[PDB]
């Protein structure tokens, strides 16, 4: 071959080998999921504890964009933190030019075009993350997942990272049992349970759970971190299911 040495060189198969290697950098990262609630969205992330030296609950790997979009990524934390940082400028210049918070289906295209640009030219690396973002706007809830191709779609539920084979199946159970809609309070309990089960591949090192959610009825359309009594009530539901 040799069609892999550099980026954006087609092979005879059509594959773009550099982008295919990028998907392997995502599969190495930690696990994250998103549930599309009946009226909002819930985000959950597995933050591996590498040492006892790490301070607890100060390395939060869930980032907010504007004041109604939660982003959480797996893969290489730097690549993502630069994708998010750039997303914040696109959203702030939308609210500057039309004076209305940016719709979530629009914010999805602007991030895609910026990723996608990094497989046209042959002198910048593809991005090594998969991002699961969304939130609430005038239409309601949206959940998106973004790959290093530039391919994104809507999802009832999404999952990426090492433990994604486990979680796609578990998510699917919760969409067959509730066509009515898994309600926002119920989904914080279920999120923690899914992360605790998908953590059985990584059961070498202890981990820390962090949930956040954006919900129309609960926080009035803002983005907040589930915390205190409500995060503790979920962690207890999750320990009860695995034992």
């Amino acid at each position: 071959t040799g069609y892999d040495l550099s980026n954006s060189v087609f092979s005879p198969d059509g594959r773009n080998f550099q982008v295919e290697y990028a998907v392997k950098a995502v599969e190495n990262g930690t696990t994250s999921i998103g549930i599309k609630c009946n009226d909002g969205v819930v985000f959950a992330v597995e933050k591996l504890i590498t040492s006892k030296l790490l301070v607890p609950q100060k390395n939060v790997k869930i980032q907010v964009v504007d004041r109604h979009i939660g982003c959480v990524y797996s893969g290489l934390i730097p690549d993502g933190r630069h994708l998010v940082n750039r997303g914040r400028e696109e959203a702030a210049s939308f609210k500057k030019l039309y004076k209305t918070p940016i719709p979530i289906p629009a914010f999805a295209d602007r991030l895609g075009q910026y990723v996608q640009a990094h497989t046209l030219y042959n002198s910048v690396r593809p991005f090594g993350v998969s991002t699961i973002f969304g939130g609430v706007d005038k239409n309601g809830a949206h959940l998106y997942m973004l790959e290093p191709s530039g391919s994104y779609w809507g999802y009832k539920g999404a999952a990426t990272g090492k433990g994604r084979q486990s979680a796609k199946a578990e998510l699917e159970k919760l969409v067959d049992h509730h066509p009515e809609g898994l309600s926002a309070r119920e989904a914080v309990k279920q999120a923690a349970k899914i992360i605790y089960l998908a953590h059985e591949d990584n059961k070498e090192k202890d981990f820390e759970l962090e949930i956040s959610w954006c919900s129309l009825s609960e926080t009035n359309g803002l983005h907040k971190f589930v915390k205190g009594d409500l995060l503790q009530e979920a962690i207890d539901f999750a320990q009860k299911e695995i034992n």
Partner: protein, 241 residues
């Protein structure tokens, strides 16, 4: 031999990087059709949601480029999003410089020239998509213009794109040697949606649910896509007959 890694004339005269781009397109196993009516253009396209988690409505391949040029794309979906964003910008820019609505001809010829620039410069890969613009022009009536990753474009009485195109192509050839016109005659545009679907069922050998099609109709004054109920209405009217 660096001629299979950038676009320079091979020792043979070919552009291997471009010949490769065509085989990258046909890979989604989506089969697209576009036939002309008397006063409309119908395009029907297969939709294939793979897993029950993906939301059905957000998956799509028909884009609304302006108010009268819809564009159905065949290829990988990031390149389509790239080709779509750029086409929308030109249909706006046109109306701003010249004060009328970009005819279909003109848009298809603009993308063609934009495609060429990428096979001439050494620092961009060609796009991996086949674009099919459909409209009811103001001057020339119903139109279809299909464009390629070489730069080539040409007019069409009816077209089909995808892996299994050979079945549909030869089915359309048979119908226009029978009727001896260039366009499906039937007057209303619902009869032409019926006609499109019936030739898809025959060609591919398989019937359709309402979740497997996404349909787009161009009449003068608007381009629109049909909802899952308006598709269900056509499907039941074909089963009656």
């Amino acid at each position: 031999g660096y001629d299979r890694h950038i676009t320079i004339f091979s020792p043979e005269g070919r552009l291997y990087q471009v010949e490769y781009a065509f085989k990258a397109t046909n890979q989604t196993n989506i089969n697209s059709l576009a036939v002309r009516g008397k006063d409309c253009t119908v395009v029907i396209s297969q939709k294939k949601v793979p897993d029950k988690l993906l939301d059905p409505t957000t998956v799509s391949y028909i884009f609304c480029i302006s108010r009268t040029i819809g564009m159905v794309v065949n290829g990988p979906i990031p390149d389509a999003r790239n080709a779509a964003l750029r086409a929308k910008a030109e249909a706006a820019e046109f109306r701003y410089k010249y004060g009328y609505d970009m005819p279909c001809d003109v848009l298809a010829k603009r993308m063609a020239n934009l495609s060429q620039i990428y096979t001439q410069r050494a620092y961009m890969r060609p796009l991996g998509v086949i674009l099919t613009f459909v409209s009811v022009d103001e001057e020339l009536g119903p139109s279809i213009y299909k464009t390629d990753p070489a730069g080539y474009y040409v007019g069409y009485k009816a077209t089909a794109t995808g892996p299994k195109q050979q079945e549909i192509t030869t089915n359309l050839e048979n119908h226009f040697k029978k009727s001896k016109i260039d366009h499906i005659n039937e007057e209303s545009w619902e009869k032409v949606v019926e006609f499109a679907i019936t030739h898809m069922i025959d060609a591919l050998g398989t019937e359709f649910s309402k979740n497997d099609l996404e349909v787009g109709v161009a009449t003068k004054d608007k381009f629109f896509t049909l909802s899952a109920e308006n598709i269900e209405e056509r499907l039941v009217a074909i089963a009656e007959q």
